[PDB]
Amino acid sequence: SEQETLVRPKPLLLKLLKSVGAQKDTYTMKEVLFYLGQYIMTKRLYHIVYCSNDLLGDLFGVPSFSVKEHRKIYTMIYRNLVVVN
Numbered sequence: 797s798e799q800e801t802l803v804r805p806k807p808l809l810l811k812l813l814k815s816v817g818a819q820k821d822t823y824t825m826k827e828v829l830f831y832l833g834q835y836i837m838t839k840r841l842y843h844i845v846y847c848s849n850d851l852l853g854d855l856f857g858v859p860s861f862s863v864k865e866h867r868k869i870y871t872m873i874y875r876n877l878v879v880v881n
């Protein structure tokens with residue numbers, strides 16, 4: 797239900813997705829969640845992910861978070877996109 801949703805990332809998020817191969821302007825949340833997982837392991841920011849002094853921090857507005865807290869994560873991802881009507 798929620799992962800199927802189609803979204804349109806804001807610039808700061810598009811930049812992040814593109815740095816890992818993304819190349820579209822619209823995405824299902826499943827894809828977004830996945831590309832973020834990719835970014836996290838490639839830049840080696842990580843259950844605790846440290847995002848200060850990194851683009852992901854500008855995206856989430858926090859210096860760190862736990863990968864177990866999905867609802868919180870979703871909320872931080874959501875501020876950086878708009879849903880596709």
Ligand SMILES: CC[C@@H](C(=O)OC(C)(C)C)N1C(=O)[C@@H](CC(=O)O)C[C@H](c2cccc(Cl)c2)[C@H]1c1ccc(Cl)cc1
Nearest residue numbers: 828829830832833834836837863864865866867869870
């Ligand atoms: C950090 C690794 C990444 C992943 O699966 O990445 C691969 C293995 C798919 C690449 N990942 C996990 O490893 C899981 C963490 C956990 O054991 O709870 C799931 C997690 C997640 C799933 C669905 C929604 C949300 Cl908000 C979070 C998901 C994740 C997705 C996005 C973000 Cl920012 C942080 C974590």
